[PDB]
Design a protein around this motif. Sequence first.
Motif, PDB file in Angstrom:
ATOM      1  N   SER A  73      -5.630  -1.758  -5.217  1.00  5.61           N
ATOM      2  CA  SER A  73      -4.816  -0.718  -4.869  1.00  5.61           C
ATOM      3  C   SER A  73      -5.791   0.402  -4.675  1.00  5.61           C
ATOM      4  O   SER A  73      -6.118   1.261  -3.659  1.00  5.61           O
ATOM      5  CB  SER A  73      -3.875  -0.197  -6.080  1.00  5.61           C
ATOM      6  OG  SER A  73      -3.141   0.901  -5.651  1.00  5.61           O
ATOM      7  N   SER A 140       3.802   4.702 -13.385  1.00 11.21           N
ATOM      8  CA  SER A 140       4.618   3.725 -12.645  1.00 11.21           C
ATOM      9  C   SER A 140       5.521   4.254 -11.543  1.00 11.21           C
ATOM     10  O   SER A 140       6.113   5.603 -11.743  1.00 11.21           O
ATOM     11  CB  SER A 140       5.287   2.755 -13.446  1.00 11.21           C
ATOM     12  OG  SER A 140       6.296   2.296 -12.821  1.00 11.21           O
ATOM     13  N   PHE A 178       5.585  -1.113  -4.020  1.00  8.86           N
ATOM     14  CA  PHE A 178       5.645  -0.066  -4.977  1.00  8.86           C
ATOM     15  C   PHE A 178       7.017   0.948  -4.749  1.00  8.86           C
ATOM     16  O   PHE A 178       7.298   1.761  -5.429  1.00  8.86           O
ATOM     17  CB  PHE A 178       4.208   0.960  -5.013  1.00  8.86           C
ATOM     18  CG  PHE A 178       3.035   0.384  -5.379  1.00  8.86           C
ATOM     19  CD1 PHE A 178       3.115  -0.192  -6.858  1.00  8.86           C
ATOM     20  CD2 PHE A 178       1.988   0.139  -4.791  1.00  8.86           C
ATOM     21  CE1 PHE A 178       1.931  -0.759  -7.029  1.00  8.86           C
ATOM     22  CE2 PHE A 178       0.972  -0.173  -5.041  1.00  8.86           C
ATOM     23  CZ  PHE A 178       1.011  -0.981  -6.280  1.00  8.86           C
ATOM     24  N   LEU A 243       8.277   6.761  -2.579  1.00  9.64           N
ATOM     25  CA  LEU A 243       8.220   6.298  -3.878  1.00  9.64           C
ATOM     26  C   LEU A 243       9.575   6.972  -4.489  1.00  9.64           C
ATOM     27  O   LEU A 243      10.034   7.989  -4.319  1.00  9.64           O
ATOM     28  CB  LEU A 243       7.182   6.632  -4.758  1.00  9.64           C
ATOM     29  CG  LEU A 243       5.741   6.256  -4.092  1.00  9.64           C
ATOM     30  CD1 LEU A 243       4.652   6.741  -4.944  1.00  9.64           C
ATOM     31  CD2 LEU A 243       5.756   4.662  -3.800  1.00  9.64           C
TER      32      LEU A 243
END
Lengths: 306, 306
Positions: A73, A140, A178, A243
Motif C-alpha cells: 500500500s 483503519s 479498503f 472510504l
Amino acid sequence: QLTPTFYRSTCPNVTSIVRGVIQDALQTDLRIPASLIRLHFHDCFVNGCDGSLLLDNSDTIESEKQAAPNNNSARGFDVVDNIKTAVENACPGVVSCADILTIAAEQSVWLSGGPSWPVPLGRRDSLTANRTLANQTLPSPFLTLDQLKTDFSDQGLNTTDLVALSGAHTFGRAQCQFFSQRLYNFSATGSPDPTLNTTLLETLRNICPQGGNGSTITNLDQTTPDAFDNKYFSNLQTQYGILQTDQELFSTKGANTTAIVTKFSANQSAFFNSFVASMIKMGNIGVLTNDEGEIRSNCRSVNGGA
Amino acid sequence: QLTPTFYRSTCPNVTSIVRGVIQDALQTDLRIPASLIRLHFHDCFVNGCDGSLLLDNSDTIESEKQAAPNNNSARGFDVVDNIKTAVENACPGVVSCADILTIAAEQSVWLSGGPSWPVPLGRRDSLTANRTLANQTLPSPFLTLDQLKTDFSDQGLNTTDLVALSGAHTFGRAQCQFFSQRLYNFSATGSPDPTLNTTLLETLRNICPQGGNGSTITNLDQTTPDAFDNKYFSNLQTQYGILQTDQELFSTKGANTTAIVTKFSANQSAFFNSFVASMIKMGNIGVLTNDEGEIRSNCRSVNGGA
Ligand SMILES: *[C@@H]1O[C@H](CO)[C@@H](O[C@@H]2O[C@H](CO)[C@@H](O[C@@H]3O[C@H](CO[C@H]4O[C@H](CO)[C@@H](O)[C@H](O)[C@@H]4O)[C@@H](O)[C@H](O[C@H]4O[C@H](CO)[C@@H](O)[C@H](O)[C@@H]4O)[C@@H]3O[C@H]3OC[C@@H](O)[C@H](O)[C@H]3O)[C@H](O)[C@H]2NC(C)=O)[C@H](O[C@@H]2O[C@@H](C)[C@@H](O)[C@@H](O)[C@@H]2O)[C@H]1NC(C)=O
Ligand SMILES: *[C@@H]1O[C@H](CO)[C@@H](O[C@@H]2O[C@H](CO)[C@@H](O[C@@H]3O[C@H](CO[C@H]4O[C@H](CO)[C@@H](O)[C@H](O)[C@@H]4O)[C@@H](O)[C@H](O[C@H]4O[C@H](CO)[C@@H](O)[C@H](O)[C@@H]4O)[C@@H]3O[C@H]3OC[C@@H](O)[C@H](O)[C@H]3O)[C@H](O)[C@H]2NC(C)=O)[C@H](O[C@@H]2O[C@@H](C)[C@@H](O)[C@@H](O)[C@@H]2O)[C@H]1NC(C)=O
Ligand code: HEM
Ligand code: HEM
Ligand SMILES: *[C@@H]1O[C@H](CO)[C@@H](O[C@@H]2O[C@H](CO)[C@@H](O)[C@H](O)[C@H]2NC(C)=O)[C@H](O[C@@H]2O[C@@H](C)[C@@H](O)[C@@H](O)[C@@H]2O)[C@H]1NC(C)=O
Ligand SMILES: *[C@@H]1O[C@H](CO)[C@@H](O[C@@H]2O[C@H](CO)[C@@H](O)[C@H](O)[C@H]2NC(C)=O)[C@H](O[C@@H]2O[C@@H](C)[C@@H](O)[C@@H](O)[C@@H]2O)[C@H]1NC(C)=O
Ligand SMILES: *[C@@H]1O[C@H](CO)[C@@H](O[C@@H]2O[C@H](CO)[C@@H](O)[C@H](O)[C@H]2NC(C)=O)[C@H](O[C@@H]2O[C@@H](C)[C@@H](O)[C@@H](O)[C@@H]2O)[C@H]1NC(C)=O
Ligand SMILES: *[C@@H]1O[C@H](CO)[C@@H](O[C@@H]2O[C@H](CO)[C@@H](O)[C@H](O)[C@H]2NC(C)=O)[C@H](O[C@@H]2O[C@@H](C)[C@@H](O)[C@@H](O)[C@@H]2O)[C@H]1NC(C)=O
Ligand SMILES: *[C@@H]1O[C@H](CO)[C@@H](O)[C@H](O[C@@H]2O[C@@H](C)[C@@H](O)[C@@H](O)[C@@H]2O)[C@H]1NC(C)=O
Ligand SMILES: *[C@@H]1O[C@H](CO)[C@@H](O)[C@H](O[C@@H]2O[C@@H](C)[C@@H](O)[C@@H](O)[C@@H]2O)[C@H]1NC(C)=O
Ligand SMILES: *[C@@H]1O[C@H](CO)[C@@H](O)[C@H](O)[C@H]1NC(C)=O
Ligand SMILES: *[C@@H]1O[C@H](CO)[C@@H](O)[C@H](O)[C@H]1NC(C)=O
Ligand SMILES: *[C@@H]1O[C@H](CO)[C@@H](O)[C@H](O)[C@H]1NC(C)=O
Ligand SMILES: *[C@@H]1O[C@H](CO)[C@@H](O)[C@H](O)[C@H]1NC(C)=O
Ligand SMILES: *[C@H]1O[C@H](CO)[C@@H](O)[C@H](O)[C@H]1NC(C)=O
Ligand SMILES: *[C@H]1O[C@H](CO)[C@@H](O)[C@H](O)[C@H]1NC(C)=O
Ligand SMILES: [Ca+2]
Ligand SMILES: [Ca+2]
Ligand SMILES: [Ca+2]
Ligand SMILES: [Ca+2]
Ligand SMILES: [Cl-]
Ligand SMILES: [Cl-]
Ligand SMILES: [Cl-]
Ligand SMILES: [Cl-]
Ligand SMILES: [Cl-]
Ligand SMILES: [Cl-]
C-alpha cells in the motif's frame, strides 16, 4: 523547538532540492505527491515524525513497511531515496530523512495546486521501528467517526485536524479492499452502505466485483483526482466519499464534523488555512531533536550495522 | 413486410408483456436494458435479425455465443428465457424469439429514458447459427473509422446509421480487454492514444493495470452510465469515448462523422429521431418471414431435436 530556518546555514537550498526531485518524479508518476504525503503521515503517527517507516528489515529491524496499513500500500520509497541522494550530494550528513519526508509532504501539496507554508525543521532519524504499533495506531478505513476522533486525539489532533487532514484524500488512490465492504455487505447488513451515492455505488461495483482482485485501485477524489483542492469536501456533500471514514465526516447523524465539511466545501481558502495549521501540528508529533537519534546517510538503514 | 400490428389479433399484449419482464429484471440488474439491446444488434448482424445468437450448442449447432465478439461478453440470455416464458404463457406458439429480441431492444431504450417507437414485427426464428460469420462480421473495437463504415455498409447501414447506433453506448459496460490497447501501447507506438482525455486515461490506467484482469469493466458512458441520452456524444467532444471506435467518430482527421456527433451532442431530439430510424433499419436486416424458419418454443433450441 523546530524552526523553518534550521538549515539556513548548513543546507540553504534544501527545500528547493527536495522540490526539484519531486518535480522530476512527477514526469513518470502523477501519483507521487499523494504517496509522499501519505508516507509522512504514516511516519508521524508511529512513534512520531522520525523516519521510522523508511527503515527496511534487518537483523534488528522488523520494518513498519509490512504493518497491515503499509503492506502492499505505502509507496514512493525509491523516490525518497532519490531525494536523500540529491540532498546528500549538496549537503552531506546534514538533513535527516524525518525532515526530508516533512518537506516532501509540503512540496507535494504545493506542486499539486495546494497551499505552501514555511516547514518547521530540525527532526532527527530514529534507530527503531515498530510494526506492531503501526498496526495498532494507524487508523483503519472501517472506523466509525467516534473511533476516528479517538485515534486522532491519541496523537494530540482534534476534530478540526481530523477533518482538515482527511482532505489529503483530495488526491491519490485507494484499492478495492479498503472500501469494498460498503458495496455488498455493509456492517453485516447484507446490503450496501446507503451513504454511498447510488451512481458511485454502481461505478465501484463495476471495478471491485465481489470475488475479484481487491488490489485494483480508484481515485480517492472522483472529481479532481490529482489536484489538491477542496473538491474532496464537496464530494462528501453529494455522497461521493470513497472510504467509509471519508463519508462519515459528512453523513454521521448529529456529527459536528458536518459543518466543518460544508464550510471547507464552500471556502477552499478556509480549508487550506486549516490544512496548513493541522499539518504543522501533525509534523510536531513525537519528534527527536538535540543529539537524539541520528542523521541517516541512507534512509533505509541505521548508520553502521543492522 | 414487417408491421407493428403483426400480433394485434394473435398476441395483442405482447409488447406490454415484454416490457413487464424487463421492468422486473431491472429490480436486480441495472445493466439489463443495455445488455438486451446489444443481443438484438449481435443477432441482426449475423445472418439477420433471426434469433440465431440465442441458440445453444447442440449435436448440430455450434453456438454464436462463443464467437469472439460474444464469448464471456454477451449476456441477458436468462432474461430472454424469462421474456419468452411470459409471452408463451399468454400466447403459446405465437411470438418468435427474433421478435422478442427486437421488442426487448426498444423497450430497453424507452425504459432507460430514450425514445419509444412502433416496433415492426413478423420475424421468424432461424434453424442455424454461424459462429465463424459472427467472428467475421461483428465489428471489433479496434477498427478504424473507414473500417467501421465498411462494416456497416456491408449490412446496408450508412454513415448516419453508424453514428446514431453507436449512441447505444450511452449505457452499458465494457471490459478492459476492449480498450486497454489505448492505455499503454497504442497502434504499436509504445504510448497511449492521444485522443483519450488525459484524465480518463489516468482513470482507465487505474482500473486496467497493464498485467491485470482484462475482464474488469467500466461504464461506456462515464457521464450518465444508465440513462439513454445524448451524453455519449457530448463525451466524445471532451475525448471521453471509452472504445477506440467511439472516439474515432469525433476525433478522426477530416471525418464527416464529426459534424453528426456535434449535432447529436447539441440536440438530443435529433439523436433520438436518427436512432429510431436506424434501429428500424437494423431490425429489417436478413429477416425470415412467411413460413421460413419457425416460431421457437424455447429460444435456446430448435423445435424438436439438436
Ligand atoms: C511496539 O509497540 C507495541 C504496541 O504499543 C508495544 O507493546 C505495548 O507496550 C505497552 C507498554 O508501552 C503495553 O502496555 C502496557 O501493558 C501492561 C499490561 O497490560 C495488561 O495487563 C493489565 C493488568 O496488569 C491490564 O489492565 C491491561 O489492560 C492489559 O490486559 C500495563 O500494565 C501497562 O499499564 C501501565 O503502564 C502504562 C504506561 O505504558 C500506564 O499508562 C498505565 O496506567 C499502567 O500503570 C500498559 O498498558 C497500556 O495499554 C495500552 C493503552 O490501553 C493504555 O493507555 C496503556 O496503559 C502493551 O500491552 C503492549 N502491547 C502489545 C500488543 O504487546 C511494544 O512495547 C514493548 O513490547 C511489549 C511486549 C512490552 O514488553 C512493552 O513494555 C515494550 O515496551 C513496542 N515494541 C518495542 C520494541 O518498543
Ligand atoms: C458460416 O459463415 C462463413 C463466413 O461467411 C461461411 O464461409 C464463407 O463462405 C463464403 C461463401 O458464402 C466463402 O466465400 C466464397 O469463397 C470462394 C473461394 O474464395 C477463395 O478463392 C477465390 C479464388 O477462387 C479468391 O478470389 C477468394 O478471395 C478466396 O481466396 C469464392 O469463389 C466465392 O466467390 C464467388 O461467389 C460469391 C458468392 O458467395 C460471389 O459474390 C463472387 O463474386 C464469386 O463468384 C466466395 O467469396 C467471398 O469472399 C468473401 C467476400 O470477400 C466476397 O464478397 C465473397 O465473394 C468464404 O470463403 C467462406 N469463408 C470461410 C472462412 O470459410 C460459411 O459458409 C459455408 O462454409 C464455407 C467453408 C463454404 O463451404 C461456403 O460455401 C458454405 O456456405 C458459413 N457456414 C455455413 C454452414 O453456412
Ligand atoms: C483519517 C483517517 C485516515 C484513514 C482511515 C486513511 C486511510 C487510507 C486508505 C485506506 C488509503 C488507501 C491506501 C491504498 O490503497 O494505497 C489511503 C490513501 C491515502 N491517504 Fe489516507 N487515511 C487517513 C488519513 C490520512 C491523512 C491524515 C493523510 C495525510 C495528511 C492521508 C493521506 C493519504 C493519501 C494522499 C492517500 C493516497 C496515497 C496514494 O495514492 O499512494 N490520509 N488512506
Ligand atoms: C459501431 C461498432 C460497435 C463496436 C466496435 C462495438 C463494440 C462493443 C464492445 C467491445 C462492447 C463491450 C462488451 C463487453 O465488454 O461486455 C460493447 C458493449 C455494448 N454495445 Fe457496442 N459496439 C458497436 C456497435 C453497437 C451497436 C450498433 C449497438 C446497439 C444498437 C451496441 C450496443 C452495445 C451496448 C448497449 C453495450 C453494453 C452491453 C452491456 O453492458 O452488456 N453496440 N460494444
Ligand atoms: C483544534 O486545534 C486548533 C489549534 O490548532 C484550534 O484552533 C485555534 O483556536 C484557538 C482558540 O481556542 C486560537 O487561539 C487559534 O488561533 C486557533 N488556530 C487555528 C489555526 O485556527 C481549534 O479550535 C477551533 O477552531 C478555531 C478557528 C476556533 O473557532 C475555535 O473556537 C474552534 O474550537 C481546535 N479544534 C477543536 C475542535 O477544538
Ligand atoms: C448523487 O450524485 C449526483 C451527481 O453528482 C447528485 O446529483 C446532483 O446534486 C446536486 C445537489 O447537491 C444538484 O445541484 C445536481 O443537479 C444533481 N445532478 C444530477 C446530474 O442529478 C445526487 O444528488 C441527488 O439527486 C439529485 C437528482 C438531486 O435531487 C439532489 O437533491 C440529490 O441529493 C447525489 N446524491 C446524493 C444523495 O447526494
Ligand atoms: C442514411 O439513410 C437515411 C435513411 O434512413 C438517410 O436519411 C433519409 O434521407 C432521404 C433523402 O436522401 C429522405 O427521403 C429521408 O427522409 C431521410 N430519413 C431520415 C430518417 O432522416 C440518410 O441521409 C442523410 O440524412 C438526411 C436527414 C438528409 O439530410 C440526407 O441528405 C443525408 O444524406 C442516409 N445517410 C447518408 C450519410 O447517406
Ligand atoms: C478533458 O476533460 C475535461 C473535463 O471534462 C475537459 O475540460 C472541460 O472542457 C470544457 C470545454 O469543452 C470546458 O467548458 C470546461 O471548463 C472544462 N472543465 C475542466 C474542469 O477543466 C478537457 O477540456 C480541455 O481542458 C480544459 C481545461 C479546456 O481548456 C478545454 O478547452 C480543453 O478541451 C478535456 N480535454 C479535451 C482535450 O477534450
Ligand atoms: C506483506 O505482503 C507480502 C506480499 O508482497 C506477503 O507475502 C507478506 O506475507 C507474510 O509473509 C509470507 C511469506 C507469509 O508467511 C504470510 O503469512 C505473512 O503475512 C506480508 N507481510 C506481512 C507481515 O503481512
Ligand atoms: C469461450 O470462453 C470459455 C471460458 O468461459 C473458454 O473456456 C472457451 O475456450 C475454448 O474451449 C476451451 C476448452 C479451449 O479449448 C480453448 O482453446 C477454446 O477457445 C471459449 N470458446 C471459444 C470458442 O473461444
Ligand atoms: C491482482 O492480482 C494479480 C495476480 O497476482 C497481481 O499481479 C496484481 O498486482 C493484483 N492487482 C491488480 C491491481 O491487478
Ligand atoms: C467535535 O468533536 C469533539 C467531540 O465531541 C468536540 O469536543 C470538539 O470540540 C468538536 N469540534 C467542533 C469544531 O465542533
Ligand atoms: C478476473 O479473473 C478471475 C479469476 O478467475 C475471474 O474469477 C473473474 O471473473 C475475472 N473478472 C473480473 C472482473 O474480476
Ligand atoms: C460519410 O461517409 C460516407 C463515406 O465518405 C459518405 O458517402 C456519406 O455520404 C457521409 N455522410 C455524411 C452525413 O456526411
Ligand atoms: C454478510 O451476509 C450475511 C448477512 O446478511 C452473512 O451470512 C455474512 O456473515 C455477512 N458477511 C460478512 C463478511 O460478515
Ligand atoms: C509495444 O511496445 C513496443 C513498441 O515501441 C514493441 O516492442 C511491442 O511489440 C509493442 N506491443 C505490441 C503488443 O505490439
Ligand atoms: Ca514514526
Ligand atoms: Ca482533488
Ligand atoms: Ca442473426
Ligand atoms: Ca447515458
Ligand atoms: Cl493513509
Ligand atoms: Cl479511477
Ligand atoms: Cl510541517
Ligand atoms: Cl456491441
Ligand atoms: Cl464504472
Ligand atoms: Cl425495430
